Ligand binder design. Structure first.
Ligand SMILES: N[C@@H](Cc1ccc(NC(=O)[C@H]2CC/C=C/CCC2)cc1)C(=O)O
Ligand SMILES: N[C@@H](Cc1ccc(NC(=O)[C@H]2CC/C=C/CCC2)cc1)C(=O)O
Lengths: 310, 310
């Protein structure tokens, strides 16, 4: 793999590939991603941080926004409490192996120049357009607030105000990214990561839906969560156990199982694992056993770094 | 009339009368009103400035916001052009006899504290509530912008940020004023003036609908506008000529007409004029003749002050 293929690996879409090839030529190039401070950091965050590490290995200067005002507008609580949670997320991100520039959005979202462009962008953004970009982001509210439509123009304005070359995020951010590419004079290259399925197979993995694996979960907690996880035999779509093996596990992958069930099975790639699973040649119980133990080894250095603080 | 009755004269509603009686007791008390800069100042503006003069005579410190950012959000053009029009409106307001503190909204709408409370108010204002408050204010747009819902929270935030005791405006501002009384810790006393009917009787008098009488219109232009004005005999509702006589003319009012049509008619009050008009005892042509000539005498000092600048 070259540097472009390393960045494209395990992404849902790149907007666009030709524009990304331009950015890779530059000596200096920045990539940014924002997270609303979350009480628990799960594999969804780890997947995005792993992609930010790929960009860092490719010569990108990484910037991480601890989006305190975004979480405040999205009804996550008060600013002072949101900020201390964001400081906890920074420690977890650094424990993941990401050395970057962690900044709070409120450090620039109150500048007069930034605020003035918020009003300019509001003139160019329709209410229907702004609401459509927040369908997969806005916190559930039977009575949507004006803050829901201010949210997307704040994220577009930050991209313009700070001038990153590449913006990274889940597929739920694509409509906001499509709006930034239409309204801003400099088009930002967008890298969109897949949205992990919840452990119960119903919806996406969310910190507020209790269907996630936290990066600092104990080994016994990981084994129990995977044991109860949705993993129908032969079904790869919507299977969170297969997603974990595709996006986090390293290959070759040695699957250990008793001799009475076929003996240990070595798989050199995820495409080989998917083939063994579609035609029921690998049982979900054996898949869950290997995925749980390998994921525990993956997250052990992260949980250890966090346990050392106590 | 006492000071309360002087303020209540020719107003549509006061929210509330008991709260206004509290404010009148204070030595210091401020009243504010905002205008989006308009290329032409008509009787609708004069009606509100006359009410601000009443408050000034009652001991109020008057503040006038040349709402440049409001007009910018409401699609009135660019900021630099909007500001020079606002400076022209200040000259017209001063020519009307109002000596007050004329301030541009952008002088405080970019402060970090003001902007921060805009986001707080956005958390408490629903999109349906904000859109309902802008139905009679927002510029016609088949594709409403996010700026339409930012507009009402900017006006509510200014009331809180600058701390006026009384807010004045037309009846179209009542929903925004109702929102400010719900969300702000200090409830502002709201004085709402009637909305003048257009000269054609279709809709309200607007600077963009060409159904207005400008305060600096020439006498011949005033006579022609009134001659073509909607003024059905016996109909008082929606009659702009009767509105002008009620809100601008002084009484007793001597109506001059030929002897062959009843001779000159002296009316001591508008209620007497309305009685003579409902039962066709005063012809619309004679009403238009007297209203035009008296309105010309009313606006002569204003047009003269403006003509002297040339
Ligand atoms: N909307 C997202 C949250 C989010 C996503 C992105 C942003 N921030 C950004 O887009 C930043 C990122 C770091 C770079 C800063 C310079 C400019 C852009 C803020 C919040 C979600 O739903 O998780
Ligand atoms: N929405 C109105 C325009 C408008 C109305 C009011 C305001 N401003 C105000 O409410 C100001 C007025 C002067 C006092 C300033 C201190 C605080 C309040 C700004 C714009 C319309 O449609 O004409």
């Amino acid at each position: 793999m070259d540097e472009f293929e390393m960045i494209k690996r395990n992404t849902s879409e790149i907007i666009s590939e030709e524009e990304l090839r331009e950015v890779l030529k530059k000596d200096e190039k920045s990539a940014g991603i924002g997270f609303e401070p979350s009480g628990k950091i799960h594999l969804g965050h780890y997947l995005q941080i792993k992609k930010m590490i790929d960009l860092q290995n490719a010569g990108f200067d990484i910037i991480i926004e601890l989006a305190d005002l975004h979480a405040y507008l999205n009804q996550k609580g008060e600013l002072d409490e949101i900020r201390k949670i964001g400081d906890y997320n920074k420690k977890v991100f650094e424990a993941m192996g990401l050395k970057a520039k962690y900044v709070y959005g409120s450090e620039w979202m109150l500048d007069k120049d930034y605020t003035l462009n918020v009003y300019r962008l509001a003139l160019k953004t329709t209410l229907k357009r702004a609401r459509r970009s927040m369908e997969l982001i806005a916190r559930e509210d039977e009575n949507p607030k004006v803050a829901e439509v201010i949210y997307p123009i704040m994220q577009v304005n930050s991209i313009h105000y700070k001038g990153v070359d590449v913006a990274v995020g889940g597929m739920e951010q694509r409509k906001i990214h499509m709006l930034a590419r239409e309204l801003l004079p400099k088009k930002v290259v967008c890298i969109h990561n897949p949205v992990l399925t919840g452990l119960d197979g119903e919806g996406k993995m969310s910190s507020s839906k209790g269907n996630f694996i936290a990066v600092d979960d104990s080994p016994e907690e990981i084994r129990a969560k995977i044991k109860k996880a949705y993993c129908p035999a032969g079904v790869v779509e919507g299977n969170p156990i297969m997603e974990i093996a595709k996006y986090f596990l390293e290959y070759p992958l040695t699957i250990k199982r008793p001799e009475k069930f076929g003996g240990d099975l070595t798989v050199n790639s995820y495409e080989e694992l998917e083939s063994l699973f579609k035609n029921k040649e690998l049982h979900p119980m054996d898949l869950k056993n290997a995925v749980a133990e390998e994921l525990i080894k993956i997250l052990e250095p992260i949980r250890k770094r966090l346990l050392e603080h106590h």
